[PDB]
Amino acid sequence: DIQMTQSPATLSASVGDRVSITCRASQSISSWLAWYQQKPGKAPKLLIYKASSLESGVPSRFSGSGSGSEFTLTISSLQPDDFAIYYCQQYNSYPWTFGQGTKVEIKRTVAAPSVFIFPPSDEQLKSGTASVVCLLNNFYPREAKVQWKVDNALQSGNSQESVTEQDSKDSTYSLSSTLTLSKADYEKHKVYACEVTHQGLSSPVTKSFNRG
Amino acid sequence: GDTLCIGYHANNSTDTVDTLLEKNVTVTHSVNLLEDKHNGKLCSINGKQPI
Amino acid sequence: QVQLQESGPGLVKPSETLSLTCSVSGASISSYYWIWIRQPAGKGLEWIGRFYTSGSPNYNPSLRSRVTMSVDTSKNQFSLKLTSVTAADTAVYYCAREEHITFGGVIVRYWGQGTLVTVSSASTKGPSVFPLAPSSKSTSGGTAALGCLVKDYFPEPVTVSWNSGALTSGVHTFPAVLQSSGLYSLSSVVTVPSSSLGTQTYICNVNHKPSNTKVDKRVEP
Amino acid sequence: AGFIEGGWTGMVDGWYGYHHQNEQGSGYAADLKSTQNAIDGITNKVNSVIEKMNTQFTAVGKEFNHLEKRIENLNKKVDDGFLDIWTYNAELLVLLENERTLDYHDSNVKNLYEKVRSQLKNNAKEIGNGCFEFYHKCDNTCMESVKNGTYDYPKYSEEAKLNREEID
Amino acid sequence: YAFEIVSVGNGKLFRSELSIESCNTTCQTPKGAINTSLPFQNIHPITIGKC
Structure with missing residues (x-):
């Protein structure tokens, strides 16, 4: 039902840099979006729910901003462990849909x-x-x-x-x-x-x- | 015949809140706005600049 | 903790019925909705659906016709059953727990481990393990590489460990590479000080699940 | 207001919903529409109430010397009076808004019930405890049609007429 | 001797008797300090930082 455009597909940023991932929705949602981090061949781990709720135990560098049709995941200081594929899920209406995901690499020496x-x-x-x-x-x-x-x-x-x-x-x-x-x-x-x-x-x- | 009912949530939460008409009202979900504990440390904010 | 493990056959023949079972550790499955989600290789995720013991399930439309979700309260598990598998549905499966109502809507905090289900007319061909000896002709000083080759095996899932989990650093279990033979080669390597190349013994433990093979081998200079 | 009797520890997927019981078994299922509206409202409410409090910071206390006792008492009075005013505002807003929150939820109950009653005008019968007994067979598709507000009364009007009038 | 005024900010001058242990907090009271974004505290009125 609800189509997910997660731009951009591939990123590579140096440590400490701010990172923004945009997750546009086919239909607007009253900020019922969530952000998950999937480590290589590992169980995807949720980062933020309600588009503004930093899950317990998640570093404060992650901030989710958005309602309606546009949402953004913002990592304030990119760290080594934050290399993964990030997905945005919508639980507004079934069927639950995910974005194609964004791969966040790291620029180093x-x-x-x-x-x-x-x-x-x-x-x-x-x-x-x-x-x-x-x-x-x-x-x-x-x-x-x-x-x-x-x-x-x-x-x-x-x-x-x-x-x-x-x-x-x-x-x-x-x-x-x-x-x-x-x-x-x-x-x-x-x-x-x-x-x-x-x-x-x-x-x-x-x-x-x-x-x- | 078949039956169809309407209802609402309940759980084991013991969170009590007060209202003007009634106090110690146990509710499903609540948020404590009041922070009431400290670590007891005169620690630094972003640097050991505290003197 | 609530922990979700996943059991799948690894191979399903193209026109058969996929049966998957997610096992739960310490929760009353009767009191939670249970969700299945899936990922084709390294592609995006797809919500399969939701089932509950004293409720009404709901499934994704593209799989609706073929999916049945059931729950065993006796064994504490829940199972997917997919009819008329196609080789396009060949992916990793994940099972998750649907948490209760919170202020931010419903959450899926818990997640399964993921099991590969590949849909192929081929068989369960066991792996061949061959040790990657080091270089005596190399410096034999500090940096020393040791390895294990799992050269031929067919359904993708394979586990690799070193000294049964003890060797924990400098390990690079590489990705599986499909060979022209239709089999998968899988290298696994560990970097080690060359001093300990004598006093210490290094063993690779390889478990290919659907062939049900657990071959363990030495790596000596 | 128009509160109810009973609780539904089994319904774990929303503020409000249904308990269906047909040929195909029974089960709980949350109404995502009305709970979604209620969560939107309560979120916006909490945010407005809290956002109004957010204003400027200021180092509170002041120190005055022995020849300034009086402006000192005036300053402590000012600090303490702003303290009382903000405390009283917070207390009463908490109290009254918890009141109004429970009332809002009660009204959501009432709205959901009246929607279902308007869909099932005569084809069903109000049990009284907050349910409906169908004079016809309502299978899962019928249940879902009622749940998403598209129940077809003429579809089952004749079956319900026959059974209903067979009772009397 | 004289004092060149380098940078002006939003410090304070507490009267309290404690020590300094590395914690890098955000909101420090003369009594203690913890981290939280709740809207209210009953610890102390004299506060520095996002409080």
Whole structure:
């Protein structure tokens, strides 16, 4: 029944900055809106109800302002732990509707990663497959490139990539590049290397390993 | 035949309020406006500027 | 505390009946409305509906035709039953408690843990666990990375722990990545001082729920 | 005013509502419209009453010397008199507005009941305790139609006529 | 010696006998201080801050 426009979809602000999220409604509501904070893969936690009622135990930095069709969630000082997806719910009329949510990231100092290579498991080798892992821990921003150098020959693809979400404490990211292939059970070539290029690196860093 | 009733809320709240016609009226929901406790500390407001 | 846990099959075949059960810890379920809400992957939330023991339920219109909500006062649970599942309804489910009347309208302070229900014609394929040894050729000084690979498993829900919860810092259980094989690879990593690489032993405990697999493995230099 | 007898510890979803009992079972269900209006009103009331109090701050006390005893007594009198005036205003507004709040809620009761009575003019029968017995079958769709103010009297007028007149 | 008047504000000059423990409150009375946005208090009339 009631359509929810939560602008804007993505934000990134430095610590201490004020943050405002707007939640426009298709139909006006006598300030019966609520604001929830959903941490990564965690139960969504309500922040403010009645558009003006700061729930018990919520830091006072959160302030909800609005009635009619326009409401705003305002974080007075953005803190590390406030990185999440924020949703606005309406309990004026059924069906209860939520907004598409707003992702609130954090702008921080550019941080170099720490790289770690993991050779494949021999147990896996016996099953005819093979996978090596490049690991980049505690970096900022997410924009890094992890490339693969088998016998100093960059590989075409055969490498998927997973990025952790922003750490609540540090707001630093972590990435894993999984080289997956057997070929000659990678017995055809022995040299293995991780080209790591990140904004925190003046020059790229390459760690490497060979036959055990 | 079928029956349909009209009613209103009740709970276990013991909040008593006064009115002019009657006092100690126990109600479902109330708000205490009166703050009546302190921490007993001459503490700082935004800085240990208190001397 | 009132605590809400959630039990779901993880996989439902495309033309079957999804049955979900939310279990409550220390509340008389007869005296509260109970709400189901759901989230497709990382997309928005959708209010499924509300049911009560001595009241009248109400469901979302798009799911109304197919939803039945019931309550077991004996077991202290409430269950969803969705007919004619579609693979588009493939999402995380959450169960919440509808609190009583307050001055700001009705509140949902309590929340479930979320369970993934994915609707697929594939099976319950158990995970394969392989240890990520460290680098003896690396500095062997301070920074030391250790890991565990859960390389192939099919319904997404997987739990990863380290020393059964003891190792609590510097852990980066990565997101699951779908492989071209239609299986999911899942890396989990911990950063540790290299001094303790000898005296301390590090074990990864991996529990894939719908395959009902609890494989635990060592990680040695 | 026109108060009632009884309480509904089971209805946990609103100030006001219904208890329905038909072929499909029974249950409580809060009237979201009238409770929503009452919450709007009481919120606006509390906010107005409190907002009027919000005015300016001022360091209250003053100190006067031995050759200024009299302006000192006048200043203490002024402080204390503003204290009394504000105390008395707060006390009486609290008292009278709790009175009027209970009365407002009572009137909301009356309005809801008269709405339902106008919908079910003859098709039902006033029990007396604050309910209605249907001379016809009111299934869940009928219940909801009454609850959202769209009951169809000619729909059940003939069934109700037959049963009602069968009684006498 | 003389005193340059740097900044003027809204302090006070209490007569009281207490100590100073870090709490960073908003509303301080000669007796104590706690935080609350209730509209009324019966603690003390001499108050500094949002009170």
